[PDB]
Design goal:
By secondary structure, the protein is of the alpha+beta class. The chain is 23% helix and 18% strand. Helix 1 (26-43) crosses helix 3 (71-81). Bound molecules: chloride ion. One of its GO terms (biological process) is antigen processing and presentation of exogenous peptide antigen via MHC class II.
């Protein structure tokens, strides 16, 4: 059945780490990271997508730009809008601006999104293994996360229910030889390559949905 490990970065599904800077747009980076991987799966072409397009244009769907938002509202906006522009055509500036969506510059589409059963790490494992990178929310409100550097992240004060940060699960794995021991979720952050481990963090896997990684997972349908 399911592989002992997955890493979509090794198959060309993931763009290099990005930096949201001083703007609460992590939800937008998480949504573009999931759409980048589904579009790569569908066309074989990896194209960086515009977080700014989401920040400026998805207020009608319930997002609030640099004040926060949700990946599912972003996929709903891509669906209702009929498209989403490339990173190159609609560059990121980390401030709320006027919607400048240009259909001629669109390089992605989705028909809606699929939800992972909430709180179910095994359902999340199956989604990651068979679909590609998955958008997820997590409790990142801790100094231990801010200064994380390496190893399997584990924070006693983490919540599986009150989440404040959107990220992207690009795979899962384990340390050592036993595939069922010291497992982790491979997670792409949006605080620059300089943060954490080359912009990534290993989050403890199958330890009671630590930090809520499987509480609100979803992926776009392309
Ligand atoms: Cl969401």
């Amino acid at each position: 059945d399911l592989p002992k490990s997955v890493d979509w970065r090794k198959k060309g599904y993931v763009t290099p780490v990005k930096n949201q800077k001083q703007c609460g747009s992590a939800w937008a980076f998480s949504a573009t990271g999931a759409l980048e991987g589904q579009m790569f799966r569908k066309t074989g072409k990896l194209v960086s997508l515009s977080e700014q397009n989401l920040v400026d244009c998805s207020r009608p769907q319930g997002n609030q730009g640099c004040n926060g938002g949700f990946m599912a509202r972003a996929f709903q906006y891509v669906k209702e809008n009929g498209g989403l522009d490339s990173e190159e055509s609609y560059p990121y500036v980390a401030v709320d601006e006027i919607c400048k969506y240009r259909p001629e510059n669109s390089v992605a589409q989705d028909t809606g999104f699929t939800v992972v059963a909430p709180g179910k790490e095994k359902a999340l494992m199956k989604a990651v293994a068979t679909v590609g990178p998955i958008s997820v929310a997590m409790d990142a409100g801790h100094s231990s996360f801010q200064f994380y550097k390496s190893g399997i992240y584990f924070e006693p004060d983490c919540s599986s229910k009150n989440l404040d940060h959107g990220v992207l699960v690009v795979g899962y794995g384990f340390e050592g030889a036993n595939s069922q021991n010291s497992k982790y979720w491979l997670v792409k952050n949006s605080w620059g390559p300089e943060w954490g481990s080359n912009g990534y963090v290993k989050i403890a896997k199958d330890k009671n949905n630590h930090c809520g990684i499987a509480t609100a997972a979803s992926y776009p349908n392309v």
